[PDB]
């Protein structure tokens, strides 16, 4: 299996699935490094974020647990097709990159907060992470290039 994958079993159904402990992605199918990658993200900040403020809200007071619930809801809507990643990033990301549909542009190793870097480089082109935790908050990451 590609970098970071393990076989698991659904607790609700018993069917095998795959989980990546670097990106926090999970998928039903058996999964299918670059010098630079391009990613977009959606950040949900919380009260313990390094800087608990964003363009959305001057004082961010939500708990980390509440932030994770929000992230999980956005992931659901993105996976179902009810909403686009880009639309949710524009509306709800606690980062000024929201104004660019979450796009951060291209970057190499040695630039980003480490859990974000590692997730970004472990994603395949077009793939989306699960919740990724950094000192900034909790991210959904989409690798675009």
């Amino acid at each position: 299996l590609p970098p970071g994958w393990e076989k698991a079993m659904s607790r609700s159904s018993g069917r095998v699935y795959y989980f990546n402990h670097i990106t926090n992605a999970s998928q039903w199918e058996r999964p299918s490094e670059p010098a630079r990658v391009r990613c977009s993200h959606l950040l949900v900040k919380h009260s313990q974020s390094r800087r608990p403020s964003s363009w959305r809200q001057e004082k961010i007071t939500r708990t980390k647990e509440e932030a994770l619930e929000l992230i999980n809801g956005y992931i659901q809507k993105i996976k179902s097709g009810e909403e686009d990643f880009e639309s949710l990033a524009s509306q709800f990301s606690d980062c000024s990159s929201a104004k660019a549909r979450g796009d951060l542009g291209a970057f190499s190793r040695g630039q980003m907060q480490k859990p974000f870097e590692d997730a970004s480089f472990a994603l395949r082109t077009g793939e989306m992470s699960g919740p990724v935790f950094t000192d900034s908050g909790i991210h959904i990451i989409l690798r675009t290039e």
Partner: peptide, 5 residues
Amino acid sequence: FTXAQ
């Protein structure tokens, strides 16, 4: 700045 090291 967010989310740079």
